[PDB]
Amino acid sequence: LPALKLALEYIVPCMNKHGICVVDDFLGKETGQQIGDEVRALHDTGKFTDGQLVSQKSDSSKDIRGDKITWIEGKEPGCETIGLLMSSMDDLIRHCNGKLGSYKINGRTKAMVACYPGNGTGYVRHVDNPNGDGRCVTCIYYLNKDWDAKVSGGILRIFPEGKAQFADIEPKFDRLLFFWSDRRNPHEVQPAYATRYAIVVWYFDADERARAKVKYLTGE
Amino acid sequence: ELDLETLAPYIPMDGEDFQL
Ligand SMILES: O=C(O)CCC(=O)C(=O)O
Numbered sequence: 001l002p003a004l005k006l007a008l009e010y011i012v013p014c015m016n017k018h019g020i021c022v023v024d025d026f027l028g029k030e031t032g033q034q035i036g037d038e039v040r041a042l043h044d045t046g047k048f049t050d051g052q053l054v055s056q057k058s059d060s061s062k063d064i065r066g067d068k069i070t071w072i073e074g075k076e077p078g079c080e081t082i083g084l085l086m087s088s089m090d091d092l093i094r095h096c097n098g099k100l101g102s103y104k105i106n107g108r109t110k111a112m113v114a115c116y117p118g119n120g121t122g123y124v125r126h127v128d129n130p131n132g133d134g135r136c137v138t139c140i141y142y143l144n145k146d147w148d149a150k151v152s153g154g155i156l157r158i159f160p161e162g163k164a165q166f167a168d169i170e171p172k173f174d175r176l177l178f179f180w181s182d183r184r185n186p187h188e189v190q191p192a193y194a195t196r197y198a199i200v201v202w203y204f205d206a207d208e209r210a211r212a213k214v215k216y217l218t219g220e
Numbered sequence: 221e222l223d224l225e226t227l228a229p230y231i232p233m234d235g236e237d238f239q240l
């Protein structure tokens with residue numbers, strides 16, 4: 001759908017009012033299916049590795065998050081439609097310039113292609129960016145055709161600050177999701193009992209990201 | 221309190237930022 005209208009008339013007001021925005025049927029069945037095949041090819045060729053945490057301590061990462069992931073730039077052979085998804089996400093964000101809170105969004109991470117391989121895997125309650133590493137917006141695309149959350153689980157539960165209800169997001173095929181990455185939106189991925197795929201991109205605030213890079217380049 | 225960075229999903233901190 002046209003990026004300008006979607007961004008300014010739905011995403012921006014929804015994010016500023018609620019900090020969470022769901023766009024269903026983002027790319028259509030055909031494109032969503034091609035993305036799914038590309039993700040399943042990465043899975044089938046051994047590209048995924050255990051999901052990792054910002055700060056690693058005595059504990060195992062699998063006690064925290066049970067997914068396996070790979071990072072995709074978008075230009076790799078066999079990832080062309082993932083690149084199209086990424087470009088489509090970027091297009092929406094560019095049309096939001098200066099309208100999402102006070103942030104100045106000039107960059108993003110690579111795409112995290114993520115798989116919870118059933119077996120009850122999930123992600124304990126967490127904040128995506130609790131310590132100011134530059135991430136301001138989390139963007140997720142789901143590609144689980146035939147997902148029945150009542151049996152297979154995998155619901156993303158967000159606890160938006162200051163709300164009388166939490167937000168339950170089923171990992172529905174062709175669903176696009178935005179939410180603030182900071183402490184306003186603690187969230188958890190509830191156990192998945194079937195193979196669950198998503199693609200995650202984080203968008204950076206320029207000023208916060210610059211401060212985070214300074215801290216990294218000077219030894220914290 | 222808990223150090224929430226021990227639960228936060230990892231991202232590369234240098235050399236992998238995409239410019240829009
Ligand atoms: O897959 C999801 O719904 C959310 C993933 C998530 O919370 C993360 O990787 O930080």
Ligand SMILES: [Fe+3]
Pocket residue numbers: 126127128187229
């Ligand atoms: Fe998260």
